[PDB]
Amino acid sequence: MGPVWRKHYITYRINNYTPDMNREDVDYAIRKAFQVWSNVTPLKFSKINTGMADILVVFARGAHGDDHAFDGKGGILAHAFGPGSGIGGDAHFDEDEFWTTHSGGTNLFLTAVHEIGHSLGLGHSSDPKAVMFPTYKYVDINTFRLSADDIRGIQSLYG
Ligand SMILES: NC(=O)[C@H](CCC(=O)O)NC(=O)[C@H](CCC(=O)O)NC(=O)CCc1ccc(-c2cc(-c3ccccc3)cs2)cc1
Ligand SMILES: [Ca+2]
Ligand SMILES: [Ca+2]
Numbered sequence: 001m002g003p004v005w006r007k008h009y010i011t012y013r014i015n016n017y018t019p020d021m022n023r024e025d026v027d028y029a030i031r032k033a034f035q036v037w038s039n040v041t042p043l044k045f046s047k048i049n050t051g052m053a054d055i056l057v058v059f060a061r062g063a064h065g066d067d068h069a070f071d072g073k074g075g076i077l078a079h080a081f082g083p084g085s086g087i088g089g090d091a092h093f094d095e096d097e098f099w100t101t102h103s104g105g106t107n108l109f110l111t112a113v114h115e116i117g118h119s120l121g122l123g124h125s126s127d128p129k130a131v132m133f134p135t136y137k138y139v140d141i142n143t144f145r146l147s148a149d150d151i152r153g154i155q156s157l158y159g
């Protein structure tokens with residue numbers, strides 16, 4: 001097992017915005033992704049626009065300051081650090097991907113759901129129907145729901 005936030009009130013901040021999408025559409029995708037996890041836990045998420053946040057959201061390309069360089073278009077889409085101080089919790093998205101509000105390119109909302117799972121301390125699921133399954137695939141975003149496995153996983157960390 002890994003680490004967890006030793007608190008239930010968790011802040012996030014968007015460091016910077018992909019030019020792929022409009023600013024409002026980015027904020028929304030991220031907000032809705034946090035809400036997915038909020039809906040099945042006691043966790044409360046708050047966006048801040050300046051200052052120290054628990055989870056920093058970053059778009060960057062190639063080698064971008066950690067031990068985990070991105071790899072251009074395709075392959076790695078994003079990654080996130082487990083709960084902890086400093087870079088802990090932070091979620092990074094590869095700017096070399098084309099981020100979208102829909103099924104075009106790589107869907108930011110679905111990807112954020114997956115990465116925030118990691119930011120909260122989840123690992124991967126062996127269940128192909130779970131959002132924490134290790135590879136991207138588009139599913140209808142209006143009908144999207146966490147799988148029972150995702151809910152089991154997150155509730156085992158936060159009660
Ligand atoms: N070359 C690679 O692709 C490597 C290989 C994996 C490894 O060995 O680390 N991947 C990597 O390095 C990184 C690691 C970071 C992470 O895992 O988040 N992974 C990645 O870059 C991929 C991260 C990702 C994983 C899953 C999803 C999604 C799943 C779903 C979904 C919805 C319903 C049902 C089923 C699925 C919607 S969206 C989105 C994004
Ligand atoms: Ca990539
Ligand atoms: Ca952090």
Ligand SMILES: [Ca+2]
Nearest residue numbers: 020095097098
């Ligand atoms: Ca891009």
Ligand SMILES: [Zn+2]
Nearest residue numbers: 064066068092
């Ligand atoms: Zn990174």
Ligand SMILES: [Zn+2]
Nearest residue numbers: 114118124134
């Ligand atoms: Zn993952």
